[PDB]
Write a protein that binds this ligand. Structure first.
Ligand SMILES: [Mg+2]
Ligand SMILES: [Mg+2]
Ligand SMILES: [Mg+2]
Ligand SMILES: [Mg+2]
Ligand SMILES: [Mg+2]
Ligand SMILES: [Mg+2]
Ligand SMILES: [Mg+2]
Ligand SMILES: [Mg+2]
Ligand SMILES: [Mg+2]
Ligand SMILES: [Mg+2]
Ligand SMILES: [Mg+2]
Ligand SMILES: [Mg+2]
Ligand SMILES: [Mg+2]
Ligand SMILES: [Mg+2]
Ligand SMILES: [Mg+2]
Ligand SMILES: [Mg+2]
Ligand SMILES: [Mg+2]
Ligand SMILES: [Mg+2]
Ligand SMILES: [Mg+2]
Ligand SMILES: [Mg+2]
Ligand SMILES: [Mg+2]
Ligand SMILES: [Mg+2]
Ligand SMILES: [Mg+2]
Ligand SMILES: [Mg+2]
Ligand SMILES: [Mg+2]
Ligand SMILES: [Mg+2]
Ligand SMILES: [Mg+2]
Ligand SMILES: [Mg+2]
Ligand SMILES: [Mg+2]
Ligand SMILES: [Mg+2]
Ligand SMILES: [Mg+2]
Ligand SMILES: [Mg+2]
Ligand SMILES: [Zn+2]
Ligand SMILES: [Zn+2]
Lengths: 126, 136, 192, 79, 49, 48
RNA sequence: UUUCUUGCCGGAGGUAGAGCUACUGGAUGGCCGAUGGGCCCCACAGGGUUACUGACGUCAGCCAAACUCCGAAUGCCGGU
RNA sequence: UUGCCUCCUAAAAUGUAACGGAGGCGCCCAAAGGUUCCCUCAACCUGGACGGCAAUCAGGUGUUGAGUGUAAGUGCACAA
RNA sequence: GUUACGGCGGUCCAUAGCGGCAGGGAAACGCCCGGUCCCAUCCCGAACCCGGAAGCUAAGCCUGCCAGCGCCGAUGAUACUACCCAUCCGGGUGGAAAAGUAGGACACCGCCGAACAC
């Protein structure tokens, strides 16, 4: 036995991320016609869901664990743009072109910005 | 005399003096007690007189618990004055007593002396009380 | 040391309320409720006189044998709602119990004997909680005072506890404290 | 011989103005209050002095949402 | 006064559009802010009179 | 790592008096130090 | 008939009562025992002894128009 | 004493009187206004030269007891 | 469809919490390694941001079991109360608490994705 005493950086990252997410969520939400594009991000993968908060359901989703996205030899920005175009295509198939961006409690930029601008050019107006 | 060190408000309304004592109706500290039967305002004058009465009667060794505190002030406007010009200045202190509340409690070896000291105290109070024992 | 249960009669309350309870209390009857693991809160009138008699004979904590319309049940007094003034018992609570059943209870502690003369013995906690079987419940247990030395405290952990019974209270709960008898120049110095 | 008090302010007539199940117009103010004793609910907005008003026609109904008393406007069906 | 009433006038048309207050002890110089001019039609600097 | 606000920091060569050579980095604009009492000199450090 | 009454339904309260280890204050008696009190060996180090005063805490019983973890009956708003 | 604001009286909607019980106001801030993003205090224990309970540093416990220009009340840690 | 999975939510937001004991690392979730580049510290690549896959279940996460603390909580009685009787006392019919007891509870529900026979 070796009882640890401190708090781990995982806890502070996770719950501070959740607090930022909730503060954000106080002001955006998803309908059927203008759903919410929520994003997760880790050291390996980036995830997106298209949510109708009236139900708590998901309309479309994507991540960087699909076959094609793992088929890219490029950079994390390349995976981000691939996910963005894929989720834009899936949303357009589902019958929607307007959305609100839930950045997920991460600062807007880097790969999240790349994803968001890929979806922007791909057909989703936000 | 028993006087609170400070009260948040020094001019309150008269304590509502209705109902039966719900809290503080059992003898717990000593073995014999004086337990009330009528609503009243037991001032610190009454309490001091009753306590000195008990101490004079037993006079040897035994514990007297005054488990009521006079901490509610009754005011009185100065004499010869008409009505109006606001409420008076507080000048005596009171415990609000309901029928049921044990007022004084005593611990002493024997029986008759304890009973007699308790009734000596009772005679100094503005109410009817009765001597109650530690058992049902 | 099994205690023989006491045999009362009871009968189901037809209708409930403060009016019904007042009327029943007026006819020399006590309203009461059975519960426990019998999982049926059953509303029972019982004889007030016999209830008081058995509570006198065997304290607050005593097993009863209730005859509910012919059915035979074992009960144990859980609580008694008593008027502060008229002192009549108003209501009773009856856990259902059976043999070989541990149950938590509160037992009065009555100091026995005389103490050393220069000081007075005074109890702070008159009741001590014990875990014990339904039949083996002591109605009262004693604490020893026989010429103690100068003022000292007594706690539940050093009491001669009966057999088959277990202390529940934390052992460091004071029960009886011998405190030096106030002198002539010490008794009237406190209280003002 | 004088009282050093004897001043008070006007009553502001605060309180709930529309109760549960009450049909309102869009824009009706529903509860006047000081702080946020009732928090804005679905399709209910909050004014500058913390006055709750209805952002859509419907029926008033109260609720609790994560330990917060809230007021909501429910769309009644068009006959 | 220490917080007197002041007026703000557009520079490009000299029309007095707004009246406000400010502290002379803390803002000794003329206060200037970009306000909205109804006849200039757009936001213009406005300077204390 | 800001642009230029921090004080100058470069690698430095530190030589002991008793012959120890320390390969370090400091804010010394020169980058060269010699010290006569070091980790092998004090009686408390090496028991002498 | 929009009025009023009665039944049912949808509401928001903080009164009576109660409780307080749920807050703000008052307030009874115990228990351990500080810090700060005195003394010894002897230093104003350090240690322990002593009616010490006895922070905090804790056990049990309480109190409040401007206290509330709670909390009715009625009344009130609407519908039916 | 006379206008305004807050509380209790005021009897759980609103309103409610007395030379009833308590206090504030006649301002302040060009940021103490707008928006965007980020953070969580007070207190307590432990470890530190000045530095003492107390000043700044580090570790922990800490869900609100701190703070909110300004009385009081309603609020606010989702943060106001 | 199976999952000692990962997200996004809901519930008059603790019956869900705190604590304790015992497990796991498929993909995932993490920690971890570095600061070349976007970006960052009122100093610090600790945080945030960008790149990587050497090591890990020690945490975070999730799973199972404990009722020790916190939480929930009846039935009955009682307090209080509307209306009505009633020459003060008091009573009847309806409503009915707080505290306490019996007990409950180590949450439940939903929608997407991951791996897996498909
Ligand atoms: Mg650490
Ligand atoms: Mg009253
Ligand atoms: Mg009582
Ligand atoms: Mg009480
Ligand atoms: Mg008398
Ligand atoms: Mg007012
Ligand atoms: Mg505003
Ligand atoms: Mg305004
Ligand atoms: Mg300035
Ligand atoms: Mg009707
Ligand atoms: Mg109703
Ligand atoms: Mg209600
Ligand atoms: Mg109130
Ligand atoms: Mg009361
Ligand atoms: Mg007070
Ligand atoms: Mg009250
Ligand atoms: Mg009112
Ligand atoms: Mg009223
Ligand atoms: Mg009037
Ligand atoms: Mg004045
Ligand atoms: Mg501000
Ligand atoms: Mg600003
Ligand atoms: Mg700290
Ligand atoms: Mg819990
Ligand atoms: Mg793995
Ligand atoms: Mg790096
Ligand atoms: Mg583990
Ligand atoms: Mg984990
Ligand atoms: Mg609770
Ligand atoms: Mg009930
Ligand atoms: Mg009469
Ligand atoms: Mg209860
Ligand atoms: Zn102009
Ligand atoms: Zn050297």
């Amino acid at each position: 036995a070796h009882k640890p005493v401190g708090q781990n950086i995982s806890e502070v990252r996770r719950n501070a991320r959740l607090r930022r997410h909730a503060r954000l969520r106080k002001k955006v939400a998803g309908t059927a016609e203008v759903p919410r594009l929520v994003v997760n991000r880790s050291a390996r993968h980036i995830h997106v869901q298209l949510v109708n908060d009236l139900n708590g359901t998901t309309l479309a989703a994507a991540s960087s664990i699909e076959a094609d996205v793992r088929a890219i030899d490029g950079d994390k920005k390349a995976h981000s743009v691939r996910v963005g175009q894929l989720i834009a295509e899936r949303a357009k198939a589902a019958g929607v072109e307007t959305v609100v961006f839930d950045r997920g409690g991460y600062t807007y930029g880097g790969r999240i910005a790349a994803l968001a601008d890929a979806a922007r050019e791909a057909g989703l107006k936000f | 005399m028993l006087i609170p060190r400070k009260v948040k408000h020094r001019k309150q309304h008269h304590p509502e003096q209705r109902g039966i004592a719900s809290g503080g109706t059992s003898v717990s500290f000593g073995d014999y007690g004086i337990q009330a039967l009528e609503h009243a305002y037991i001032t610190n004058r009454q309490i001091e007189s009753a306590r000195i009465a008990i101490n004079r009667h037993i006079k040897r060794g035994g514990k007297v618990w005054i488990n009521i505190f006079p901490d509610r002030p009754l005011t009185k406007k100065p004499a010869e004055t008409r009505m109006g010009s606001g409420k008076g200045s507080p000048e005596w202190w009171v415990a609000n007593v309901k029928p049921g509340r044990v007022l004084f409690e005593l611990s002493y070896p024997d029986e008759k002396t304890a009973r007699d000291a308790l009734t000596r105290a009772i005679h100094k109070l503005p109410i009817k009380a009765r001597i109650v024992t530690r058992e049902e | 040391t099994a205690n023989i249960p006491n045999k009362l009669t009871a009968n189901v309350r037809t209708r409930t309320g403060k009016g019904a309870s007042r009327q029943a209390r007026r006819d020399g009857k006590v309203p009461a409720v059975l519960y426990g693991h019998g999982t049926d809160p059953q509303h029972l009138e019982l004889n007030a006189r016999d209830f008081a008699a058995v509570l006198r004979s065997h304290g607050t904590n005593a097993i009863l044998t209730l005859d509910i319309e012919g059915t035979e049940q074992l009960a144990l007094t859980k609580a008694l709602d008593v008027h502060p003034i008229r002192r009549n018992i108003q209501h009773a609570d009856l856990l259902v119990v059976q043999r070989g059943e541990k149950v938590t209870v509160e037992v009065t502690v009555l100091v026995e004997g005389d103490a050393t003369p220069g000081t007075l013995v005074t109890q702070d906690a008159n009741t001590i909680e014990i875990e014990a079987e339904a039949l083996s419940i002591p109605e009262q247990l004693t604490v020893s005072v026989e010429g103690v030395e100068a003022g000292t405290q007594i706690t539940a952990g050093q009491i001669s506890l009966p057999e088959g019974v277990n202390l529940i209270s934390d052992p460091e709960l004071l029960v009886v404290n011998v405190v030096e008898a106030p002198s002539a120049e010490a008794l009237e110095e406190e209280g003002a | 011989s004088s009282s050093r008090n004897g001043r008070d302010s006007a009553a502001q007539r605060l309180g709930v103005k529309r109760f549960g199940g009450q049909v309102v117009k869009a824009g009706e103010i529903l509860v006047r209050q000081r702080g946020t004793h009732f928090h804005p609910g679905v399709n209910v907005g909050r004014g500058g002095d913390d006055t709750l008003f209805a952002l859509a026609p419907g029926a008033v109904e109260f609720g609790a949402k994560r330990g917060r008393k809230t007021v909501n406007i429910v769309p009644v069906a068009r006959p | 006064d220490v917080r007197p009433k002041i007026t703000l006038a557009c520079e490009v048309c000299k029309h007095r559009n707004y009246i406000t207050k400010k502290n002379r002890r803390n803002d000794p110089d003329r206060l200037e802010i970009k306000k909205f001019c109804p006849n200039c039609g757009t936001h213009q600097p406005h300077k204390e009179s | 790592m800001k642009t230029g606000i921090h004080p100058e920091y470069v690698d430095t060569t530190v030589q002991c008096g008793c012959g120890h050579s320390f390969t370090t980095r400091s804010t010394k604009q020169s980058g060269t130090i010699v010290v006569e009492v070091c980790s092998q000199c004090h009686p408390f450090y090496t028991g002498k």
